[PDB]
Amino acid sequence: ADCAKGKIEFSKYNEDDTFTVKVDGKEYWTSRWNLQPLLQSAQLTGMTVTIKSSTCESGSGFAEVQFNND
Amino acid sequence: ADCAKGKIEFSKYNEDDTFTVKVDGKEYWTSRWNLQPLLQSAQLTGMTVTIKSSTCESGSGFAEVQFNND
Amino acid sequence: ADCAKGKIEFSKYNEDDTFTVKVDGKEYWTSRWNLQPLLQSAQLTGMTVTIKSSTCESGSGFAEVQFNND
Amino acid sequence: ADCAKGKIEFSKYNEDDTFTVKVDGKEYWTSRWNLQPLLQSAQLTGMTVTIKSSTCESGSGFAEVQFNND
Amino acid sequence: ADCAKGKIEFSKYNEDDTFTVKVDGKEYWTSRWNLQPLLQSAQLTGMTVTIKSSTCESGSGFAEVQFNND
Amino acid sequence: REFTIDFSTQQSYVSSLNSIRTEISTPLEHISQGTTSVSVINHTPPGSYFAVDIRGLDVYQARFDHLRLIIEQNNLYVAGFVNTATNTFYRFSDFTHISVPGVTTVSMTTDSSYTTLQRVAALERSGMQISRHSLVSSYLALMEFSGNTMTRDASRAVLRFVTVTAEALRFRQIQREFRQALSETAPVYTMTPGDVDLTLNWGRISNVLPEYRGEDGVRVGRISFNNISAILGTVAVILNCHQPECQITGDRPVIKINNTLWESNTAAAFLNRKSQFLYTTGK
Ligand SMILES: Nc1ncnc2[nH]cnc12
Ligand code: NA
Ligand code: NA
Ligand code: NA
Ligand code: NA
Ligand code: NA
């Protein structure tokens, strides 16, 4: 399901090598390393991302994310 | 065959670590990891991409793609 | 805890495989290669980074850092 | 030999994971993984590159390329 | 030794997979894989890089490099 | 051509800078409001310079009036300074192509770069303080200066004067921040990291702004402008993109991404990473 859709408010590399992004007021983290620079590029460029997951609770994990330009 | 040629309408990192792009109205996915930054970059900079594949079924995989600034 | 917050003044890769960044007048280093492109991209795009560690002090290693466009 | 010097006219990720660039009207492919994003970035910014290889005919492989500021 | 401090005049991906940058009129190569995108990003943005190494003759290798904003 | 930059008051100072800008540059069609714009330096032959007579260090007094800066017109670089009392032009080493008639030219060993100046001055620009009092000190140091090699004090003086003349001409942000030091409360202007970053990106900014067409924002490296008032409030004069240069590499000034005009090189520099997992594991 679409957990959150919006611009990345902040991103954060974590000590366990996971990566967090805050989208539409909620934080989500992914353990997929490949997503780190892709999310950073999206954040830098103001892409609208849609965090997708079977669990949408803020602070939850994700590995599916869509990237849209304006 | 040229499956699709146009701008990337959206890209998406998938739970199975594949990466999907929608081009000229159709979605294609690739399991090649290095195509992830290449496709996101093309999407961000407005490159025309030509998805190529022996078969071009909608929602089909690809591992060949040409990138043009115009 | 938040160790330093600010744009990255310089980054440096050392022969001993540590990557230093200077933020808010203090140097911190990380050997997480995942953080190299993320930090350098933050540096060249002027992102505000917040270095975080269980304990903050000059010259300590870090593996948690938040990235903000401003 | 220096085979082609100029901007990348198009690039292409190939099914065999090699990567092709067209420079000075000739196509060249490389199996050096790292060159993929580097060549694509050169391509999007119009950076002049010099393809170096044992043979310079279109269709030749290369594992050496210089990124110029021309 | 303080080898060079200046902008990257050109960069080159070498056949042995090392990567060379020309700075202050001298060429320096590095086999440090992490440095490739970083050095190209420095070249792309005109960052002043400071290369230090045991030897500074053109053709020397290095691992230490600082990326400056000035 | 000669202009005076009068430091007597904020009004005289800003008026001085505006008059210079008007004469040496032309407003961009798309970044101009009233007579406040981002202007492109008019093309002049290389070697062309204009002189800046420093006045008003002591408010409205014809005192401390023997300092003239020689500014290369195409790039606004201070090529050196003239002590009009001794009729001597101290010229930086990288400006031997700038010839000034009628003065004795002392060709210096020191070049004009900030890397050099900050070293010789033992003064970093980030955090550098400039006040009316230190400009008077700077003036005295330059008038006392002699020789072909910059001293620490002459270098500190040049750093300060370059900031309040050339850098302020280029950036309305520095003009605005610094001018407070000219007020009667005589506060201190402290050059910020942001001010320093702006000055380090002048060429890059110059290459991008001519392409601006009302996009929501502009991103040039570490520099961000979110709207036109931000641009205007920050930049006043840019190089003519037809020492600083307009081009670093490549030939694409910009890329419009999500209605933000990006310096293409900046985008290229964070879009040149390969797959993260492959990057980190391929040690
Ligand atoms: N001497 C100088 N004049 C103007 N801008 C400068 N930037 C660095 N050195 C300078
Ligand atoms: Na979840
Ligand atoms: Na297919
Ligand atoms: Na005036
Ligand atoms: Na004019
Ligand atoms: Na450019």
XYZ file of C-alpha atoms and ligand atoms in Angstrom:
648
model
C 0.000 0.000 0.000
C 1.023 3.629 -0.454
C 2.327 4.604 2.908
C 3.353 8.117 2.179
C 3.723 10.310 -0.814
C 5.598 13.557 -0.885
C 9.044 15.114 -0.916
C 11.769 13.770 1.280
C 11.913 16.074 4.283
C 15.227 14.687 5.490
C 17.129 11.483 4.954
C 19.411 9.817 7.392
C 22.046 7.150 7.194
C 21.813 4.901 10.304
C 24.453 3.063 12.300
C 23.057 -0.256 11.226
C 23.531 0.857 7.600
C 19.828 1.299 7.044
C 18.561 4.564 5.678
C 15.685 6.663 6.818
C 13.601 9.158 4.963
C 10.807 11.351 6.309
C 7.991 11.681 3.826
C 4.724 13.463 4.505
C 5.556 13.712 8.191
C 6.369 10.051 8.684
C 9.689 8.292 8.946
C 10.443 5.082 7.057
C 13.661 3.172 6.771
C 15.027 0.748 4.259
C 17.823 -1.756 4.566
C 18.343 -1.735 0.758
C 21.671 -0.066 0.253
C 20.905 0.720 -3.354
C 18.220 3.056 -2.265
C 20.539 5.334 -0.312
C 21.893 7.437 -3.159
C 18.688 7.147 -5.157
C 16.777 8.584 -2.238
C 19.405 11.238 -1.787
C 19.157 12.203 -5.475
C 15.364 12.314 -5.106
C 15.612 14.452 -1.971
C 18.112 16.833 -3.590
C 15.946 17.273 -6.624
C 12.585 17.486 -4.927
C 11.188 14.317 -6.436
C 7.882 13.179 -5.088
C 8.399 9.774 -3.637
C 5.742 7.253 -2.754
C 6.806 4.882 0.016
C 5.034 1.568 -0.494
C 4.764 -1.284 2.012
C 2.426 -3.807 3.645
C 3.064 -1.904 6.896
C 2.652 1.833 6.828
C 3.226 2.790 10.467
C 5.713 5.701 10.772
C 9.087 4.250 11.820
C 8.403 1.117 9.715
C 10.598 -0.418 7.014
C 10.173 -0.351 3.245
C 11.853 -1.587 0.078
C 9.438 -0.346 -2.535
C 9.437 3.305 -3.516
C 8.313 5.169 -6.537
C 10.031 8.296 -7.759
C 8.139 10.964 -9.616
C 9.141 14.323 -10.959
C 6.645 17.204 -10.843
C 13.121 -4.466 -30.541
C 12.573 -0.932 -29.274
C 9.973 -1.590 -26.597
C 9.458 2.015 -25.715
C 11.094 5.327 -26.306
C 10.379 8.447 -24.368
C 10.891 10.133 -21.049
C 10.712 8.191 -17.860
C 7.268 8.954 -16.362
C 8.156 7.368 -13.046
C 10.731 4.980 -11.726
C 10.362 2.630 -8.807
C 12.609 0.514 -6.678
C 10.892 -2.816 -5.985
C 10.879 -5.177 -3.081
C 12.666 -7.808 -5.097
C 15.483 -5.306 -5.817
C 14.411 -4.891 -9.400
C 13.679 -1.450 -10.751
C 10.716 -0.340 -12.752
C 10.356 2.509 -15.146
C 7.310 3.710 -16.991
C 8.097 4.915 -20.498
C 5.594 6.012 -23.169
C 2.808 4.643 -21.059
C 4.202 1.198 -20.344
C 6.071 -0.216 -17.404
C 9.180 -2.308 -17.707
C 11.428 -3.591 -15.004
C 15.063 -4.521 -14.918
C 16.992 -6.648 -12.441
C 20.339 -5.030 -13.421
C 21.361 -2.959 -10.454
C 23.544 -0.484 -12.245
C 20.569 0.489 -14.368
C 19.007 1.920 -11.206
C 21.163 5.023 -10.975
C 21.390 5.219 -14.751
C 17.615 5.257 -15.091
C 17.005 7.626 -12.233
C 19.568 10.003 -13.667
C 17.854 9.790 -17.094
C 14.534 10.487 -15.413
C 15.912 13.472 -13.521
C 17.727 15.026 -16.387
C 15.003 14.464 -18.971
C 16.800 11.969 -21.134
C 14.863 10.104 -23.767
C 15.391 6.409 -23.068
C 14.803 3.640 -25.513
C 13.950 0.421 -23.709
C 15.038 -2.524 -25.880
C 14.352 -6.196 -25.425
C 13.868 -9.318 -27.452
C 10.265 -9.282 -26.227
C 8.445 -6.094 -25.212
C 5.378 -7.243 -23.228
C 3.934 -4.589 -20.907
C 5.356 -5.228 -17.403
C 8.197 -7.251 -19.009
C 11.889 -7.190 -18.023
C 14.704 -5.502 -19.940
C 18.468 -5.153 -19.687
C 19.200 -2.984 -22.719
C 18.437 0.707 -22.803
C 19.711 3.587 -24.792
C 20.024 7.008 -23.242
C 19.823 10.248 -25.211
C 19.933 13.779 -23.857
C 17.406 14.507 -26.640
C 23.205 12.772 20.153
C 23.786 15.514 17.613
C 27.549 16.058 17.281
C 27.710 18.717 14.601
C 25.289 20.351 12.247
C 26.185 22.357 9.231
C 27.334 22.157 5.663
C 30.394 20.126 4.957
C 33.484 22.322 4.933
C 35.725 19.664 3.365
C 35.857 15.908 3.041
C 38.938 13.809 2.774
C 39.759 10.238 2.152
C 42.827 9.051 4.045
C 45.307 6.279 3.207
C 44.058 4.411 6.213
C 40.611 4.069 4.625
C 38.767 6.631 6.737
C 36.741 9.450 5.242
C 36.778 12.669 7.194
C 34.348 15.470 6.947
C 34.524 18.802 8.718
C 31.204 20.115 9.931
C 30.704 23.187 12.160
C 34.436 23.438 12.711
C 34.900 19.845 13.862
C 36.288 16.808 12.053
C 34.602 13.412 12.176
C 35.378 10.374 10.129
C 33.621 7.306 8.906
C 34.837 4.212 7.214
C 31.419 3.335 5.868
C 31.926 3.541 2.122
C 28.197 3.943 1.779
C 28.631 7.336 3.343
C 31.257 8.575 0.926
C 29.089 9.444 -2.024
C 26.291 10.538 0.310
C 28.570 12.867 2.187
C 30.355 14.157 -0.860
C 27.036 14.771 -2.623
C 25.896 16.606 0.536
C 29.088 18.609 0.442
C 28.854 19.639 -3.193
C 25.131 20.435 -3.011
C 25.413 22.316 0.271
C 23.120 20.087 2.278
C 23.008 20.571 5.982
C 24.269 17.407 7.600
C 23.812 16.432 11.215
C 26.514 14.071 12.380
C 25.131 11.861 15.147
C 26.798 9.473 17.593
C 26.095 7.903 20.968
C 28.798 10.239 22.194
C 29.884 13.420 20.479
C 33.445 14.634 20.357
C 35.991 15.827 17.879
C 37.699 13.211 15.764
C 35.348 10.303 16.545
C 34.070 7.851 13.939
C 30.434 8.138 13.044
C 27.937 6.112 11.099
C 24.740 8.115 11.579
C 24.156 11.373 9.743
C 21.079 13.224 8.719
C 20.908 15.104 5.476
C 18.702 18.162 4.895
C 18.495 20.380 1.838
C 18.549 23.302 4.208
C 45.292 4.752 -29.595
C 43.073 7.741 -28.978
C 40.085 6.652 -31.027
C 37.468 9.289 -30.559
C 37.330 12.542 -28.742
C 34.109 14.422 -28.303
C 30.836 14.444 -26.461
C 28.884 11.266 -25.933
C 26.108 11.259 -28.525
C 24.192 8.475 -26.860
C 24.989 5.749 -24.351
C 23.479 2.349 -23.992
C 23.408 -0.274 -21.293
C 23.722 -3.623 -23.040
C 22.252 -7.020 -22.318
C 25.656 -8.404 -21.512
C 26.159 -5.625 -18.963
C 28.714 -3.819 -21.064
C 28.014 -0.173 -21.828
C 28.259 1.612 -25.102
C 28.882 5.211 -25.925
C 28.847 6.881 -29.303
C 31.663 9.406 -29.600
C 32.682 11.223 -32.761
C 30.140 9.134 -34.664
C 31.601 5.786 -33.627
C 30.229 3.359 -31.106
C 32.436 1.852 -28.386
C 31.587 -0.527 -25.631
C 33.231 -1.146 -22.328
C 32.846 -3.890 -19.785
C 34.304 -1.707 -17.044
C 31.335 -1.451 -14.662
C 32.512 1.711 -13.032
C 32.507 3.539 -16.261
C 28.765 3.355 -16.613
C 27.695 6.171 -14.300
C 30.819 8.126 -15.032
C 30.150 8.065 -18.768
C 26.479 8.836 -18.242
C 27.306 11.856 -16.144
C 29.799 12.987 -18.724
C 27.065 12.509 -21.263
C 24.417 14.542 -19.498
C 26.719 17.465 -18.924
C 28.306 17.372 -22.351
C 31.739 16.561 -21.073
C 34.204 15.771 -23.840
C 35.709 12.294 -23.464
C 38.525 10.599 -25.349
C 37.943 6.892 -25.957
C 41.227 4.969 -26.103
C 41.513 1.512 -27.483
C 43.573 -0.874 -29.527
C 41.106 -0.467 -32.431
C 39.066 2.568 -33.271
C 36.384 1.304 -35.639
C 32.878 1.694 -34.465
C 32.026 -1.434 -32.501
C 35.408 -1.566 -30.719
C 35.802 -2.155 -27.003
C 37.637 0.162 -24.644
C 38.769 -0.012 -21.029
C 40.389 3.426 -20.979
C 38.740 6.794 -21.309
C 39.784 10.279 -20.458
C 37.255 12.859 -19.242
C 38.274 16.295 -20.493
C 37.200 19.788 -19.553
C 36.953 20.996 -23.188
C 54.350 14.902 0.731
C 52.023 17.711 -0.434
C 51.707 16.812 -4.033
C 49.129 19.020 -5.611
C 46.285 21.227 -4.684
C 44.137 22.413 -7.525
C 41.298 21.546 -9.847
C 41.180 18.370 -11.851
C 42.258 19.193 -15.383
C 41.281 15.762 -16.628
C 40.491 12.393 -15.217
C 41.084 9.039 -16.855
C 39.880 5.532 -16.167
C 42.867 3.301 -16.834
C 43.076 -0.179 -18.344
C 44.255 -1.570 -14.977
C 41.080 -0.040 -13.424
C 42.962 2.618 -11.523
C 41.871 6.183 -12.064
C 44.075 9.138 -12.843
C 43.562 12.800 -12.310
C 45.757 15.597 -13.567
C 46.135 18.318 -10.956
C 48.598 21.219 -11.027
C 50.099 19.858 -14.200
C 50.913 16.424 -12.823
C 49.127 13.113 -13.161
C 48.332 10.946 -10.159
C 46.606 7.623 -10.156
C 44.672 5.859 -7.484
C 43.539 2.278 -7.279
C 41.117 3.226 -4.467
C 37.818 2.270 -5.966
C 35.814 4.519 -3.681
C 37.537 7.540 -5.147
C 36.347 7.249 -8.730
C 32.936 8.880 -8.530
C 34.274 11.282 -5.915
C 37.072 12.453 -8.121
C 34.818 12.813 -11.093
C 32.299 14.810 -8.998
C 35.235 17.020 -7.956
C 36.230 17.482 -11.552
C 32.614 18.242 -12.564
C 32.207 20.914 -9.906
C 35.672 22.348 -10.086
C 36.511 21.383 -6.518
C 40.007 22.028 -5.392
C 41.490 18.683 -4.451
C 44.572 18.228 -2.362
C 46.496 15.110 -3.188
C 49.166 13.884 -0.831
C 51.375 10.890 -1.355
C 54.816 9.519 -0.521
C 56.029 10.705 -3.919
C 54.799 13.612 -5.968
C 56.368 13.062 -9.333
C 53.815 12.904 -12.108
C 52.818 9.265 -12.463
C 52.815 8.673 -8.681
C 49.990 6.843 -6.999
C 47.909 8.202 -4.147
C 45.170 7.279 -1.806
C 44.868 10.476 0.222
C 42.829 13.282 -1.251
C 40.934 16.153 0.278
C 37.934 17.718 -1.406
C 37.740 21.420 -0.729
C 35.016 23.908 -1.508
C 37.464 26.724 -2.037
C 37.634 54.750 -16.197
C 37.632 55.647 -12.518
C 34.987 55.363 -9.880
C 34.914 56.256 -6.260
C 33.645 53.891 -3.631
C 32.729 56.161 -0.769
C 32.521 54.447 2.598
C 31.103 57.458 4.447
C 27.627 56.010 4.898
C 25.581 53.085 3.767
C 23.953 55.391 1.262
C 27.194 56.644 -0.217
C 28.666 53.121 -0.274
C 25.651 51.478 -1.954
C 25.304 54.436 -4.292
C 28.981 54.002 -5.238
C 28.575 50.330 -5.989
C 25.398 50.842 -7.930
C 27.044 53.504 -10.105
C 29.886 51.156 -10.898
C 27.515 48.345 -11.764
C 25.506 50.560 -14.008
C 28.521 51.586 -15.985
C 30.191 48.208 -16.368
C 27.317 45.813 -16.746
C 23.947 45.243 -18.275
C 20.916 43.860 -16.494
C 19.753 40.368 -17.374
C 16.432 40.558 -19.167
C 14.936 38.018 -16.770
C 16.346 39.032 -13.425
C 15.755 42.713 -13.105
C 13.329 44.785 -11.069
C 13.386 48.550 -11.252
C 17.065 49.344 -11.527
C 18.084 46.498 -9.214
C 19.238 43.524 -11.194
C 21.674 40.724 -11.714
C 23.786 42.316 -14.472
C 26.269 40.826 -16.852
C 29.613 42.547 -17.118
C 29.793 44.210 -20.518
C 32.427 42.723 -22.702
C 35.726 44.652 -22.655
C 39.105 43.743 -24.072
C 41.200 41.640 -21.801
C 43.564 43.929 -19.909
C 40.837 46.539 -19.502
C 40.535 47.831 -15.955
C 38.800 50.570 -14.076
C 40.212 52.322 -11.050
C 38.354 52.619 -7.734
C 39.260 55.518 -5.517
C 38.649 54.615 -1.893
C 37.026 57.464 0.015
C 35.096 58.104 3.151
C 36.956 55.711 5.420
C 36.740 58.625 7.869
C 33.105 59.618 7.268
C 32.802 62.497 4.785
C 36.412 63.616 5.307
C 38.976 64.057 2.566
C 41.476 62.019 4.647
C 42.849 58.560 3.954
C 42.361 59.304 0.295
C 45.496 57.943 -1.364
C 44.330 54.412 -2.021
C 43.108 53.341 -5.426
C 42.302 49.755 -6.426
C 42.885 48.615 -9.972
C 40.097 46.284 -11.012
C 40.200 44.109 -14.093
C 36.935 44.932 -15.681
C 35.934 41.640 -17.190
C 36.215 39.704 -13.938
C 36.213 42.345 -11.256
C 39.483 41.107 -9.882
C 41.546 43.537 -7.871
C 44.740 43.377 -9.906
C 46.574 45.479 -7.362
C 46.448 48.761 -5.528
C 47.856 52.198 -6.108
C 49.347 54.451 -3.457
C 48.486 57.781 -5.129
C 50.786 59.611 -2.778
C 53.847 57.716 -4.086
C 52.244 57.142 -7.515
C 52.967 53.451 -7.160
C 50.858 50.571 -8.473
C 51.529 47.296 -6.589
C 50.361 44.658 -9.016
C 49.683 41.053 -8.273
C 51.795 38.509 -10.107
C 48.864 37.142 -12.036
C 48.014 40.489 -13.479
C 51.074 41.382 -15.499
C 48.643 41.834 -18.425
C 47.127 44.828 -16.659
C 49.066 47.954 -17.434
C 48.337 51.230 -15.777
C 49.822 54.348 -17.372
C 51.523 57.129 -15.422
C 52.299 55.234 -12.250
C 55.408 53.330 -11.297
C 54.358 49.671 -11.468
C 55.796 47.338 -8.871
C 55.295 43.782 -10.122
C 54.727 41.646 -7.095
C 55.755 38.079 -6.424
C 52.458 37.479 -4.645
C 49.468 36.408 -6.707
C 45.885 37.634 -6.162
C 44.292 34.366 -5.064
C 42.513 33.942 -1.809
C 44.555 30.814 -1.153
C 47.672 32.942 -1.264
C 46.244 35.981 0.422
C 44.774 34.102 3.305
C 48.106 32.331 3.819
C 50.197 35.421 3.750
C 47.630 37.261 5.821
C 47.305 34.446 8.381
C 43.627 35.307 8.129
C 40.840 33.102 6.897
C 37.984 34.847 5.117
C 35.399 32.713 6.842
C 34.937 34.590 10.094
C 36.954 37.553 8.877
C 35.826 40.737 10.543
C 35.672 44.033 8.724
C 34.734 47.293 10.346
C 35.253 50.890 9.481
C 38.154 50.778 11.929
C 39.826 47.790 10.266
C 39.369 49.374 6.842
C 41.238 52.379 8.165
C 43.903 50.023 9.451
C 43.864 48.274 6.086
C 44.294 51.561 4.322
C 47.265 52.542 6.511
C 48.859 49.156 5.971
C 48.570 49.536 2.205
C 49.900 53.069 2.278
C 52.853 51.902 4.362
C 53.419 48.888 2.141
C 56.487 48.870 -0.004
C 58.254 46.096 -1.806
C 57.446 43.436 -4.407
C 56.159 40.902 -1.893
C 52.950 41.206 0.086
C 53.388 41.307 3.852
C 50.905 39.881 6.306
C 49.340 43.236 6.983
C 49.099 44.267 3.356
C 47.476 40.899 2.621
C 44.955 41.356 5.423
C 44.194 44.807 4.010
C 43.695 43.412 0.475
C 41.440 40.674 1.783
C 39.308 43.242 3.494
C 39.209 45.686 0.633
C 38.552 43.033 -2.003
C 35.606 41.865 0.054
C 33.993 45.245 0.399
C 34.649 46.341 -3.153
C 34.864 43.546 -5.731
C 32.919 40.951 -3.763
C 30.248 43.465 -2.773
C 30.023 44.567 -6.418
C 29.385 40.968 -7.421
C 27.087 40.098 -4.555
C 24.385 42.299 -3.279
C 24.360 39.953 -0.246
C 27.816 41.086 0.780
C 26.987 44.694 -0.022
C 23.979 44.398 2.292
C 25.731 42.650 5.134
C 28.855 44.674 5.063
C 27.198 48.032 4.767
C 25.913 47.791 8.346
C 29.548 48.289 9.487
C 29.367 51.739 7.982
C 26.590 52.872 10.225
C 27.154 55.131 13.183
C 26.883 52.212 15.604
C 30.018 50.975 13.780
C 29.231 47.294 14.237
C 31.507 44.649 12.844
C 30.729 42.790 9.648
C 31.785 39.162 9.964
C 32.162 37.357 6.722
C 30.076 34.206 6.914
C 30.648 30.750 5.454
C 27.704 31.559 3.199
C 29.355 34.795 2.037
C 32.541 32.856 1.398
C 30.650 30.153 -0.492
C 29.034 32.738 -2.699
C 32.336 34.238 -3.686
C 33.728 30.803 -4.478
C 30.847 30.121 -6.851
C 30.783 33.343 -8.805
C 31.790 31.801 -12.092
C 29.368 28.939 -11.705
C 26.538 31.236 -10.779
C 27.452 33.424 -13.738
C 27.033 30.543 -16.143
C 23.635 29.625 -14.831
C 21.706 32.787 -14.162
C 21.530 33.909 -17.793
C 19.447 30.796 -18.368
C 16.938 31.610 -15.643
C 13.393 32.020 -16.928
C 11.387 32.321 -13.775
C 11.927 28.792 -12.464
C 10.913 28.226 -8.855
C 14.531 28.035 -7.803
C 18.165 27.854 -8.837
C 20.723 25.427 -7.574
C 24.366 25.934 -8.237
C 26.512 23.618 -6.216
C 26.100 24.590 -2.576
C 24.178 27.698 -3.609
C 20.414 27.811 -3.593
C 18.064 30.617 -4.605
C 14.408 29.915 -3.994
C 12.825 32.761 -5.855
C 13.751 35.896 -7.667
C 14.031 38.099 -4.593
C 16.580 35.610 -3.263
C 18.525 35.864 -6.455
C 18.372 39.672 -6.486
C 19.112 39.940 -2.825
C 22.197 37.836 -3.294
C 23.753 38.500 -6.683
C 24.297 41.804 -8.417
C 26.870 41.253 -11.140
C 28.005 38.164 -13.011
C 30.689 37.328 -15.538
C 29.780 37.572 -19.182
C 29.517 33.926 -20.150
C 29.973 34.449 -23.905
C 40.767 33.463 -12.156
C 36.995 32.912 -12.529
C 35.563 31.264 -15.624
C 32.071 30.406 -16.738
C 32.814 26.880 -17.675
C 34.359 24.145 -15.611
C 33.753 21.189 -17.853
C 31.084 20.093 -20.279
C 28.965 22.477 -22.288
C 25.544 22.366 -20.672
C 24.893 25.284 -18.394
C 21.762 23.956 -16.850
C 19.157 21.306 -16.466
C 15.649 22.145 -15.377
C 14.525 19.540 -12.856
C 11.172 19.888 -11.086
C 11.008 23.561 -11.969
C 14.406 24.289 -10.443
C 17.225 25.391 -12.666
C 20.246 23.277 -11.751
C 23.814 23.865 -12.762
C 24.146 20.704 -14.873
C 27.572 19.878 -13.389
C 26.073 19.801 -9.942
C 23.454 17.301 -10.949
C 26.030 15.290 -12.868
C 28.152 15.180 -9.731
C 25.567 13.353 -7.617
C 24.134 11.316 -10.533
C 27.471 9.671 -11.327
C 27.316 7.064 -8.562
C 27.010 3.418 -9.400
C 24.824 0.962 -7.462
C 25.491 1.523 -3.785
C 25.779 -2.119 -2.927
C 28.336 -2.634 -5.704
C 30.168 0.498 -4.698
C 30.638 -0.408 -1.074
C 31.420 -4.021 -1.538
C 33.862 -3.457 -4.394
C 36.729 -2.379 -2.220
N 42.331 39.933 -5.794
C 41.028 39.616 -5.954
N 40.099 40.544 -6.409
C 38.771 40.214 -6.571
N 38.214 38.998 -6.321
C 39.194 38.082 -5.858
N 38.992 36.770 -5.519
C 40.208 36.280 -5.138
N 41.214 37.162 -5.187
C 40.567 38.314 -5.655
Na 6.675 -1.179 6.275
Na 11.401 -7.919 -22.243
Na 25.629 56.142 -7.312
Na 24.738 49.484 -17.876
Na 27.617 23.247 -16.832
